[PDB]
Amino acid sequence: CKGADGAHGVXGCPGTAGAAGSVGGPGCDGGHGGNGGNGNPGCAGGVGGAGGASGGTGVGGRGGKGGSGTPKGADGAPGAP
C-alpha cells in the first residue's frame, strides 16, 4: 500500500508548486510529491513536492519533478524512510 500522491502543479506565472506526497499509512510506502507546474515565457517553474515519509516500510515517496520555466523549478526531496 502507499499514501496518496500530492497534486501536480499547473502552468502559470509562476508555475505552481507540486504538493508534498502523503505519509504512508501504517505499513505503507510514502506518496509521491506532485510535479511542479511549467512557467509561461518569462516566468519561473514550480518546485516539485517532497515525497511523503514511509509508514514504517523504509520506502519514502519520490520528490516531484520541477517545472520548466525561466528559471526551472527544483525537484522535490524524497520522503524519509
Added chain:
Amino acid sequence: XXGXXGXXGXXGXXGXXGXXGXXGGXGXXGGXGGXGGXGXXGXXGGXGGXGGXXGGXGXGGXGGXGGXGXXXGXXGXXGXX
C-alpha cells in the same frame, strides 16, 4: 488566491485517503481536499480527497470529509468550477 489544500489522511486500519487539493493557478480558487484518515476501532475510515479545480474563478476546492471509523469513509468530490 487559492491553490494549496491536500494533505489529511492518517489513522489506520483502514484510515488512509486524503490527497486531492491543488488546482488553482490562473486566477486562483481550487485547494480543498484532505480529510480522510480515521479508522482505529473496528476499522473503516478513509475517503476524503477531492477538491482541486479552480483556475478560472469558478470556485473549486471543497472535498475533504471522510474519516471517522466503522464505518466513516466517503467524502471527496468537489473541485471543478
